[PDB]
Design a protein around this motif. Structure first.
Motif, mmCIF file in Angstrom:
data_model
loop_
_atom_site.group_PDB
_atom_site.id
_atom_site.type_symbol
_atom_site.label_atom_id
_atom_site.label_comp_id
_atom_site.label_asym_id
_atom_site.label_seq_id
_atom_site.Cartn_x
_atom_site.Cartn_y
_atom_site.Cartn_z
ATOM 1 N N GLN A 29 47.453 37.222 25.527
ATOM 2 C CA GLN A 29 46.187 37.818 25.159
ATOM 3 C C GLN A 29 45.179 37.494 26.225
ATOM 4 O O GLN A 29 44.811 36.332 26.403
ATOM 5 N N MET A 30 44.741 38.494 26.969
ATOM 6 C CA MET A 30 43.822 38.222 28.047
ATOM 7 C C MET A 30 42.439 38.710 27.701
ATOM 8 O O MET A 30 42.230 39.909 27.518
ATOM 9 N N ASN A 31 41.478 37.808 27.586
ATOM 10 C CA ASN A 31 40.133 38.219 27.247
ATOM 11 C C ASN A 31 39.254 38.176 28.477
ATOM 12 O O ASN A 31 39.581 37.477 29.433
ATOM 13 N N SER A 32 38.156 38.931 28.482
ATOM 14 C CA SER A 32 37.205 38.848 29.583
ATOM 15 C C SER A 32 37.871 38.959 30.941
ATOM 16 O O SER A 32 37.740 38.038 31.760
ATOM 17 N N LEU A 33 38.592 40.059 31.184
ATOM 18 C CA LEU A 33 39.299 40.204 32.442
ATOM 19 C C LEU A 33 38.328 40.489 33.563
ATOM 20 O O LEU A 33 37.303 41.157 33.386
ATOM 21 N N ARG A 34 38.660 39.992 34.738
ATOM 22 C CA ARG A 34 37.860 40.180 35.937
ATOM 23 C C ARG A 34 38.694 40.790 37.049
ATOM 24 O O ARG A 34 39.913 40.834 36.971
ATOM 25 N N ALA A 35 38.061 41.259 38.116
ATOM 26 C CA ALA A 35 38.795 41.909 39.206
ATOM 27 C C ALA A 35 39.889 41.015 39.779
ATOM 28 O O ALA A 35 40.963 41.494 40.171
ATOM 29 N N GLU A 36 39.651 39.714 39.763
ATOM 30 C CA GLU A 36 40.561 38.700 40.260
ATOM 31 C C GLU A 36 41.870 38.626 39.469
ATOM 32 O O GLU A 36 42.833 38.014 39.925
ATOM 33 N N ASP A 37 41.901 39.225 38.278
ATOM 34 C CA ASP A 37 43.065 39.205 37.420
ATOM 35 C C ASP A 37 43.985 40.388 37.673
ATOM 36 O O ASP A 37 45.010 40.517 36.988
ATOM 37 N N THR A 38 43.660 41.255 38.646
ATOM 38 C CA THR A 38 44.583 42.353 38.908
ATOM 39 C C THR A 38 45.860 41.773 39.455
ATOM 40 O O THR A 38 45.854 41.051 40.452
ATOM 41 N N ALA A 39 46.955 42.091 38.801
ATOM 42 C CA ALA A 39 48.237 41.555 39.200
ATOM 43 C C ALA A 39 49.365 42.182 38.450
ATOM 44 O O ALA A 39 49.152 42.784 37.398
ATOM 45 N N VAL A 40 50.566 42.016 38.961
ATOM 46 C CA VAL A 40 51.717 42.356 38.167
ATOM 47 C C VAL A 40 52.048 41.135 37.351
ATOM 48 O O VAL A 40 52.212 40.053 37.903
ATOM 49 N N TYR A 41 52.112 41.281 36.046
ATOM 50 C CA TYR A 41 52.403 40.150 35.187
ATOM 51 C C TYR A 41 53.845 40.186 34.792
ATOM 52 O O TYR A 41 54.363 41.243 34.438
ATOM 53 N N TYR A 42 54.495 39.032 34.847
ATOM 54 C CA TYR A 42 55.898 38.899 34.516
ATOM 55 C C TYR A 42 56.172 37.871 33.449
ATOM 56 O O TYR A 42 55.568 36.795 33.433
ATOM 57 N N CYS A 43 57.181 38.138 32.640
ATOM 58 C CA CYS A 43 57.699 37.118 31.750
ATOM 59 C C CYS A 43 58.844 36.428 32.417
ATOM 60 O O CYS A 43 59.613 37.047 33.164
ATOM 61 N N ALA A 44 59.008 35.155 32.107
ATOM 62 C CA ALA A 44 60.169 34.451 32.587
ATOM 63 C C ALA A 44 60.666 33.447 31.550
ATOM 64 O O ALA A 44 59.897 32.803 30.828
ATOM 65 N N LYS A 45 61.982 33.328 31.506
ATOM 66 C CA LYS A 45 62.730 32.439 30.629
ATOM 67 C C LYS A 45 62.963 31.079 31.232
ATOM 68 O O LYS A 45 63.545 30.984 32.320
ATOM 69 N N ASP A 46 62.545 30.029 30.521
ATOM 70 C CA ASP A 46 62.749 28.654 30.951
ATOM 71 C C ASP A 46 64.214 28.320 30.734
ATOM 72 O O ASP A 46 64.771 28.615 29.678
ATOM 73 N N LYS A 47 64.862 27.769 31.732
ATOM 74 C CA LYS A 47 66.277 27.445 31.650
ATOM 75 C C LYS A 47 66.681 26.406 30.599
ATOM 76 O O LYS A 47 67.835 26.389 30.164
#
Ligand SMILES: *[C@@H]1O[C@H](CO)[C@@H](O[C@@H]2O[C@H](CO)[C@@H](O[C@@H]3O[C@H](CO[C@H]4O[C@H](CO[C@H]5O[C@H](CO)[C@@H](O)[C@H](O)[C@@H]5O)[C@@H](O)[C@H](O[C@H]5O[C@H](CO)[C@@H](O)[C@H](O)[C@@H]5O)[C@@H]4O)[C@@H](O)[C@H](O[C@H]4O[C@H](CO)[C@@H](O)[C@H](O)[C@@H]4O[C@H]4O[C@H](CO)[C@@H](O)[C@H](O)[C@@H]4O[C@H]4O[C@H](CO)[C@@H](O)[C@H](O)[C@@H]4O)[C@@H]3O)[C@H](O)[C@H]2NC(C)=O)[C@H](O)[C@H]1NC(C)=O
Ligand SMILES: *[C@@H]1O[C@H](CO)[C@@H](O[C@@H]2O[C@H](CO)[C@@H](O[C@@H]3O[C@H](CO[C@H]4O[C@H](CO[C@H]5O[C@H](CO)[C@@H](O)[C@H](O)[C@@H]5O)[C@@H](O)[C@H](O[C@H]5O[C@H](CO)[C@@H](O)[C@H](O)[C@@H]5O)[C@@H]4O)[C@@H](O)[C@H](O[C@H]4O[C@H](CO)[C@@H](O)[C@H](O)[C@@H]4O[C@H]4O[C@H](CO)[C@@H](O)[C@H](O)[C@@H]4O[C@H]4O[C@H](CO)[C@@H](O)[C@H](O)[C@@H]4O)[C@@H]3O)[C@H](O)[C@H]2NC(C)=O)[C@H](O)[C@H]1NC(C)=O
Ligand SMILES: *[C@@H]1O[C@H](CO)[C@@H](O[C@@H]2O[C@H](CO)[C@@H](O[C@@H]3O[C@H](CO[C@H]4O[C@H](CO[C@H]5O[C@H](CO)[C@@H](O)[C@H](O)[C@@H]5O)[C@@H](O)[C@H](O[C@H]5O[C@H](CO)[C@@H](O)[C@H](O)[C@@H]5O)[C@@H]4O)[C@@H](O)[C@H](O[C@H]4O[C@H](CO)[C@@H](O)[C@H](O)[C@@H]4O[C@H]4O[C@H](CO)[C@@H](O)[C@H](O)[C@@H]4O[C@H]4O[C@H](CO)[C@@H](O)[C@H](O)[C@@H]4O)[C@@H]3O)[C@H](O)[C@H]2NC(C)=O)[C@H](O)[C@H]1NC(C)=O
Ligand SMILES: *[C@@H]1O[C@H](CO)[C@@H](O[C@@H]2O[C@H](CO)[C@@H](O)[C@H](O)[C@H]2NC(C)=O)[C@H](O)[C@H]1NC(C)=O
Ligand SMILES: *[C@@H]1O[C@H](CO)[C@@H](O[C@@H]2O[C@H](CO)[C@@H](O)[C@H](O)[C@H]2NC(C)=O)[C@H](O)[C@H]1NC(C)=O
Ligand SMILES: *[C@@H]1O[C@H](CO)[C@@H](O[C@@H]2O[C@H](CO)[C@@H](O)[C@H](O)[C@H]2NC(C)=O)[C@H](O)[C@H]1NC(C)=O
Ligand SMILES: *[C@@H]1O[C@H](CO)[C@@H](O)[C@H](O)[C@H]1NC(C)=O
Ligand SMILES: *[C@@H]1O[C@H](CO)[C@@H](O)[C@H](O)[C@H]1NC(C)=O
Lengths: 108, 388, 122, 388, 388, 122
Positions: free
Chosen positions: F82-100
């Motif tokens: 849940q991302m609140n108050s997004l700013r220009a600095e938050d532009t990105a590709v977001y990924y999920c990853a599984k902890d081993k």
């Protein structure tokens, strides 16, 4: 005090079910429910004991079960020689044993 | 050895007979006997022992003053031979902590002890007398467990844990262990609303646990666990016969998927054997306090909301103090069925006898029989004046 | 094999007593409790009384309670029923039956063996 | 292992020598020693132990006040290593109850304990440390048993039980057990009229028991049991030498099929070894109270109504208190015959020493020898004033 | 059996959990518990036991007056089951002397005890409970050893011994033993200047010992021993974190080949686990006295002279008394790595609590875990006023 | 095999919120903790947040601390951000990853599996 159908029937090869309904102090009280088969003029034979055990000499067409306060006798593969008065019985909390009203089983 | 498999059914219970009794408080009046609480009984393949949480002091020592408290650094899980008192000299420490559980899996014993502060508690799981694995607190409010025997099937030993408020909702989990390691875990499911201190026994049909509902109900939660699938469900005992303490008076009709209201934020550990017609419930006699103890044969109590007792037996008179109770079995005994057994903690001293500054308990244990045997109350009987 | 043989039947004018017995053979008498069951002509089976293997515990159906006494003589392999104050309602074929369970005080049946029965008319 | 078979005869008894002595009361003056009563000695294939019924308290504790009573919830059957005192810390509880018996069958030990109220008592039969079978009361008046070692042959262990008045006729039965289960039972037969507390020993000829007649006789009943056939007979010892306590003075001619009159409603547990010429009888020295103890060689005492002692030995002087006595044997000992042994309870405190509120006992045990050895009295000797 | 081989590495240490605690002083207030000092923990293939040097008297006896002394004829090395108190009745004496060490080699236990007067002391080396070999004093000034577990590899057990002034240079030697006999010996080499009381643990890389420098340093000497080659080197822990007691305040930069100055002629036994990033140091909290105890994760402490803690755990609060500490391991445990463990002596009575004339200790023991577990102080807590 | 599928990407005017999620399959969700990592176009990888296997422990990178919330629903095998108050600095590709690591509270990685990522533009 244990109520049974007055009679049941079916044709040869069909299965029939004979119920026996008591109270929580009787049939649903203890797993000491048994069934007996009586032909006119003869002493009764034990068919099932402790709800589902068949004595040696008793065929596997006779089986039974219990749920709640109701006991049940199943006769599979009904044969013409199975015509008899069937009775249920059980041990009650009074430290007495009772027999049900009896069911007449006929074959069609 | 091989792992114990739950292959047999329960033996018909017509009456209960004495199995063991340690007379710990009575002997301890003038001998080196430890102060304990929250006892249980558990068996290995060739031996039964009494288990309890020790306060690290003897009954007549000066450190017995203040033993009323439940959680301290001094608490440890100890065991000693059945029917002997929890002496200083014959006891063995299994692990350290203020809450625990244990069981033999057919090859070696597993035990779990919980220690730490109220907001940073942890569980250490031991197997074959060595630490194997640990679980840290997740709700940060008294991590706690069963205080009884756990039951294993083919090496898998489900353990019930709770972390959270004792007067409101809490996070209840079941962890499935094998040789001290965790294979699986589950969040509590089903219709029970609050679970603590589960008393479990096994049979060929799975593992059945009767628990305490310290939040709302006067009836008890039941957890039904399948150790092969490692899955479970839950509900309350339907019977109108109430079994917690304190409790309101018994209704004509009970509840199955909801706690029976009347006495909030309290209760006592207890047990039941649920087996259709062969169903017995244990409870205190007093409804206001933990005194007396009786067994009632209440057919189909788990599912019949109008069931009432048809037979029963007094274990402890209501004139005498009682306590926590629970179930156990000898899963290695000879025969074609399991003989059900149970124990009752008999609490002496604080909080009811204020003439002394200590609290301690004695253990009485009984097993089922197929005979209808005579009954006798089995009180503690230590005279409190001898300690003054 | 197991046999149970009833005797002592007959006709009793109302208010009079009658004593029935069964001779047991083919099993150890002392190891099993025993029961009496009666059947009025045209009716189902009615349990009457049970006695434990050592004679220490005796229980009766309410319908005969206070009028009938059950006893056994272990040295003669014989079961007895003493019926006092018989009434018309007591007309029945009376049967002995062997309790299946071995040296137990659990008087629950099943009725493993039945005799042939003897008629008592009142 | 294999079951013990009674294949050997008895060894010639020319004299008796000390086998064991625990000094329990003497040590217990200032140590953690339990209050016990009704001791016996019994052997396993590789160990002999002392057995007794504990009162659940130590000698110097305050719960020792009132230990004079015979039946309570606190009583249990315990055992401890031969010649050590019945301490809190080295004792093992075998079972719970106020009356008991036990024996090893060559594979595992059987024990029976009786508990419950006077009118609703029951026996629980244990085998290999687990409950196996139960017997409920039949006469509703103190179910009671042997208070000694039982004897097994090829796995079958006959046990003598009595239920009924101690001052009149009673229902006496023999149950034949195998691996804790009942194979057969019999009502008492023969000419004995009242039987309690039978002391039994075996030989290649069967099992012989000497019992107490608490109703009428000053002589003792004898039960002769055939463990293979599982049948028995009974009679009294014919000898004019009387062995119960209290007793009238010895007559010139005794009785064989009837109790010898003179002292009704009383008596003490005791024993004899009956072997034709090799026959020894034990008895107290006082005829009025349970003091002293002696062994008399009285040839053919079982069948000769005019037999008198030809040799004897003092075990305890009549100045000292005695108590219950009985027989035991090591059926696994090396040799071509069985060495006969016996024990005597030495009772201290109540009911004779009223300066204290406790009753307790010490155990002295002796075995036969083929040598003619010197004798010495073996008293208890604890000084009662040290407990005041 | 086979000799234990050091084939595994250490398990990652993220946090420490309770392993054992005897509560000896607390229980001993009113029970038969021995006065001990200088405890250690050591494991056999199937059992862990507590070891300590006994003063030959109980805590409440009158011979406890003067137990402050370190060397007397009454001192002996005893052992008892882990987490039970050092009682009179459950303890076993391993050997006699005022200084000792011991370890199991995978087949049988070796132990060494030192006895004799200050100027004529000798060591007796026992193996499999029999004397095997002896070493006489060489510097004639308190022959002394490790006071902890020794570590064996393929039957060879290096032992560190010191003989000479405790306030100046001393003759430090390492003897290599096999089955109690001496195979080799070496004079101490490397850059450490004074060594006493080494705490040793093994790993697949060899045997590592952390020792006390009672002459000059606030940092600790480390001996690195190769049991196959039977060779060794030495240095100080480089880290600026100081671990002895008393000590000056921690500098920004430590020393590696020279003792860190500030507090001469004093110190306390302690330990460290040195494993690169997985490095933990134990120490007291007070810098002036032996109170409190903490564990610090100080990466590369052995070689990095500017390293500082990045994580830590409190074991004992500085409000409570501490004492000697040291390392141990279960070298027979299941798994692919060794679980590091340690113990802390909690000293009560003299020299700090002058209200009593005795000195004694309790033992607290903890093991590592890979989980980040909650912490709790583990104090002694016996109330000193109860002994007055 | 293990798959993690990101969704909920899109364009967010600055100051507005956006909610991302990953559908997990091929493994038991309940046995592993999970991480979010983001990559601004042309930049390296930035760790954003981690949640433990039972949801009890949640940690964030300082750069999003106080603005983002991480959560998981174990009954749906779904991870949320849940991302609140997004700013220009938050532009990105977001990924999920599984902890081993299996059922542990040690939130240390490695990141065993990665999803494909979804772009959030601000
Ligand atoms: C020697 O040893 C033997 C060993 O067994 C001893 O034998 C045992 O003796 C004890 C004596 O206590 C018995 O225990 C009690 O058993 C009764 C159950 O039996 C009764 O009910 C049976 C059920 O049938 C009835 O109802 C059905 C309903 O449809 C109906 O169809 C049927 O016709 C009948 O009406 C009956 O079969 C049974 O009959 C037998 O007994 C009769 C007695 O006079 C006899 O006449 C008959 O011929 C026949 O023999 C009998 O009626 C239990 O109910 C009882 O438990 C209650 O009472 C105890 C007393 O202290 C109490 O502590 C319990 O808590 C409980 O009472 C509470 O709960 C009830 C629940 O409904 C409630 O109604 C009560 O008001 C009360 O509730 C209050 O208190 C609780 C807690 O304090 C609180 O929570 C509540 O809110 C509320 O405040 C006992 O278990 C043994 O069963 C018996 N054993 C055997 C095998 O026989 C022998 O006595 C010893 N001898 C000597 C000399 O010592
Ligand atoms: C070193 O150690 C050795 C180890 O053995 C010691 O040797 C032992 O010493 C003890 C000493 O007490 C002996 O015990 C007593 O033995 C006698 C049995 O021997 C006597 O009788 C034999 C039988 O033959 C006689 O009768 C037949 C009948 O037809 C006749 O044909 C025959 O000719 C003869 O008349 C004799 O062979 C035997 O002879 C030997 O001894 C003689 C002694 O002076 C010697 O002269 C001979 O040459 C030969 O050596 C001898 O006569 C037991 O009878 C006796 O038991 C009675 O007395 C004790 C005393 O306190 C008492 O407690 C017993 O209860 C019992 O007395 C009661 O019962 C009697 C039954 O009939 C009754 O008559 C009495 O009046 C009395 O009854 C009263 O009290 C009881 C209970 O309180 C009550 O119930 C009654 O109603 C009534 O009130 C002892 O057993 C050992 O035998 C001897 N052992 C051996 C192997 O030799 C040695 O001494 C030690 N040395 C030292 C220095 O310490
Ligand atoms: C539930 O249980 C869990 C179980 O773990 C509990 O969690 C544990 O809580 C304890 C609380 O004590 C923590 O112990 C302390 O840990 C710190 C180490 O962490 C700090 O430093 C890390 C290193 O990075 C910093 O330095 C580098 C350098 O380049 C720099 O680059 C970097 O940016 C940073 O500056 C930090 O990462 C770490 O950050 C974390 O914590 C922050 C706290 O507020 C938080 O804000 C961050 O976000 C992050 O979470 C943190 O800063 C140890 O240093 C500390 O040990 C010192 O303090 C104790 C206090 O009594 C003292 O006893 C020790 O002796 C020691 O202090 C002495 O030595 C110092 C050495 O340099 C010296 O500087 C001091 O002045 C002092 O020295 C004086 O006294 C000594 C002896 O008396 C004497 O010899 C000296 O001469 C001198 O007199 C503790 O170990 C646990 O680590 C923590 N565990 C875990 C896994 O998290 C949890 O709290 C429990 N919860 C509840 C509710 O109970
Ligand atoms: C048990 O411990 C309590 C304290 O927890 C002691 O009670 C205190 O005794 C002192 C003695 O004068 C009183 O001044 C305090 O007010 C007492 N406190 C309380 C709460 O009552 C108590 O005396 C100890 N008991 C024994 C037997 O030692
Ligand atoms: C042993 O118990 C008895 C009671 O069974 C105690 O005797 C009573 O003591 C009180 C004290 O004044 C007397 O008033 C009673 O009359 C006594 N009863 C009898 C029957 O004598 C006895 O004091 C206790 N003994 C000890 C040593 O504690
Ligand atoms: C412990 O031993 C010391 C001696 O080592 C005892 O102290 C002496 O007690 C006598 C008694 O009057 C004094 O005169 C001495 O001056 C004391 N010596 C010292 C050094 O103080 C001490 O009393 C003993 N303590 C106990 C509790 O017995
Ligand atoms: C327990 O039952 C399972 C069922 O598959 C079986 O595989 C297993 O071998 C049994 N365990 C033992 C110890 O016999
Ligand atoms: C220990 O390692 C050495 C290395 O050569 C090997 O020879 C020895 O057999 C090993 N010991 C054991 C007990 O396996």
């Amino acid at each position: 005090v244990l109520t049974q159908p007055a009679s049941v029937s079916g044709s040869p090869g069909q299965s029939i079910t004979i119920s026996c309904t008591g109270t929580s102090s009787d049939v649903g009280g203890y797993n000491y429910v048994s069934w007996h088969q009586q032909h006119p003029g003869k002493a009764p034979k034990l068919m099932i004991y402790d709800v589902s055990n068949r004595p040696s000499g008793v065929s596997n067409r006779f089986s039974g079960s219990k749920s709640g306060n109701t006991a049940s006798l199943t006769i599979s593969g009904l044969q013409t020689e199975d015509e008899a008065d069937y009775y249920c019985s059980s041990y009650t909390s009074s430290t007495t044993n009772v027999f049900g009203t009896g069911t007449k089983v006929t074959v069609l | 050895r091989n792992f114990n498999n739950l292959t047999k059914g329960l033996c018909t219970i017509n009456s209960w007979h004495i199995y063991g009794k340690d007379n710990a408080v009575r002997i301890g009046e003038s001998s080196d006997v430890l102060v304990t609480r929250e006892p249980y009984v558990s068996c290995d393949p060739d031996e039964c022992r009494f288990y309890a949480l020790s306060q690290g002091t003897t009954i007549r020592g000066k450190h017995s003053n203040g033993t009323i408290h439940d959680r301290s650094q001094y608490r440890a899980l100890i065991s000693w031979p059945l029917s002997s008192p929890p002496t200083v000299y014959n006891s063995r420490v299994e692990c350290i902590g203020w809450s625990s559980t244990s069981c033999h899996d057919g090859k070696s014993r597993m035990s779990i002890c919980i220690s730490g502060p109220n907001n940073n508690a942890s569980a250490v799981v031991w197997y074959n007398r060595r630490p194997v694995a640990e679980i840290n607190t997740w709700a940060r409010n008294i991590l706690r467990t069963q205080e009884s025997e756990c039951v294993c099937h083919n090496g898998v030993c489900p353990v019930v844990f709770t972390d959270g408020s004792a007067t409101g909702p809490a996070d209840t989990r079941i962890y499935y262990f094998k040789e001290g390691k965790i294979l699986k875990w589950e969040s509590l499911t089903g219709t029970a609303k609050h679970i603590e201190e589960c008393s479990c026994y096994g049979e060929r049909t799975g593992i059945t646990c009767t628990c305490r509902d310290n939040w709302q109900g006067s009836n008890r939660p039941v957890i039904q666990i399948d150790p092969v699938a490692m899955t479970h469900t839950s509900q309350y005992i339907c019977s109108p016969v109430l079994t917690d303490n304190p409790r309101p008076n018994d209704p004509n009709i009970g509840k199955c998927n909801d706690p029976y209201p009347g006495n909030n934020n309290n209760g006592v550990k207890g047990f039941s054997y649920l087996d259709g017609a062969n169903t017995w419930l244990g409870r205190t006699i007093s409804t206001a306090s933990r005194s007396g103890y009786e067994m009632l044969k209440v057919p189909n109590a788990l599912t019949d909301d109008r069931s009432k007792p048809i037979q029963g037996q007094t274990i402890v008179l209501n004139a005498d103090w009682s306590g926590y109770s629970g179930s156990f079995m000898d899963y290695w005994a000879e025969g074609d069925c399991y003989r059900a057994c149970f124990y009752v903690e008999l609490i002496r001293g604080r909080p009811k006898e204020d003439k002394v500054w200590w609290t301690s308990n004695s253990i009485v244990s009984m097993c089922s029989s197929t005979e209808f045997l005579g009954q006798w109350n089995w009180p503690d009987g230590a005279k409190i004046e001898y300690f003054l | 094999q197991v046999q149970l043989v009833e005797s002592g039947g007959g006709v009793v004018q109302p208010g009079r007593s009658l004593r029935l017995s069964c001779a047991a053979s083919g099993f150890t008498f002392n190891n099993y409790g025993m029961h009496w069951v009666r059947q009025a002509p045209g009716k189902g089976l009615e349990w009457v009384a049970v006695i434990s293997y050592d004679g220490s515990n005796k229980y009766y159906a309410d319908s005969v309670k206070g009028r009938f006494t059950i006893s056994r003589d272990n040295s003669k392999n014989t079961l007895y029923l003493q019926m006092n104050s018989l009434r018309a309602e007591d007309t029945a074929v009376y049967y002995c039956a062997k309790d299946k369970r071995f040296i137990t005080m659990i008087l629950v049946g099943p009725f493993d063996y039945w005799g042939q029965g003897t008629l008592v008319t009142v």
